[PDB]
């Protein structure tokens, strides 16, 4: 909705400029509107907070109820604690090159998580 929002902003700016120019040229019952407005504002704030809570605590509660397929906080620490330590060239942490006692030749590790639409899929980090 790039063009739609652009046109809306343009119309709003045109209206604002017209009102400002007009002001410059001119310069030289049981209604309870406040109560209804406050009620509508409270309803809107409650709807926004409910949408936020649904986005946060309902779509991220997968591993909270039962450990399922999720690379987030369930896969990376596994392989970390099991094989190597953390390091940051860019995202390269503990490549397996026997550098502890090799002393022959160095080799780095291009290890990085990736996404794919499937069931039970890990990060699958990349001689070969």
């Amino acid at each position: 909705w790039p063009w739609d929002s652009v046109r809306n902003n343009l119309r709003s700016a045109l209206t604002e400029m017209c009102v400002l120019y007009d002001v410059l040229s001119i310069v030289r019952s049981p209604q309870t509107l406040q109560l209804i407005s406050k009620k509508k504002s409270l309803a809107g704030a409650a709807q926004i907070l409910l949408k936020g809570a649904e986005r946060l605590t309902k779509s991220v509660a997968e591993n909270q109820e039962n450990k399922l397929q999720r690379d987030f906080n369930s896969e990376l620490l596994r392989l970390r604690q099991h094989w190597k330590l953390r390091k940051v060239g860019d995202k390269i942490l503990g490549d397996l090159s026997y550098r502890s006692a090799g002393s022959l030749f160095p080799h780095h590790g291009t290890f990085e998580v990736i996404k794919n639409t499937d069931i039970d899929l890990d990060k699958k980090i990349p001689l070969e």
Binding site: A13, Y21, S29, T32
Partner: protein
Amino acid sequence: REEKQLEASLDALLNQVADLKNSLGSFIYKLENEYDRLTWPSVLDSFALLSGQLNTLNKVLKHEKTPLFRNQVIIPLVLSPDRDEDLMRQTEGRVPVFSHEVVPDHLRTKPDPEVEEQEKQLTTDAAGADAAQKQIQSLNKMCSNLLEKISKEERNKQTFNPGDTNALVAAVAFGKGLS
């Protein structure tokens, strides 16, 4: 006196609003060529920066040190649909050259408002204003007390003792303290 200061403040606010509108238009035009990787947070921040600065200036120049609105009357300079070459650079946004058959659907400052009548008709359908006001006042008082409490509540173990280190270094070599 006060009228001149109000006019100068209104002119400065209009200039700032025009600059902010030009900046927002340039940003929106930059959001059309680079349509990819358009995060919602950047658009939200742009919309907040484009609305807040203008709305605050508009509200400050309307409910702060204003005289009674019964003496001042609204009167424009002139209503002439003449095409002048020395007057098209003095409106800054619209009314460059007025048309002939434009009086009907252009004269109400291009009225966008369409929900005001619907809201009025919906409120008229509910025709008791004493408990609601009291509850609103109580909620306002509670929010004020909470904000005051928050404002009132809002307002490195060492392990490298140099003395002990120097003493140990001395005892390592000098006999004073060591033996």
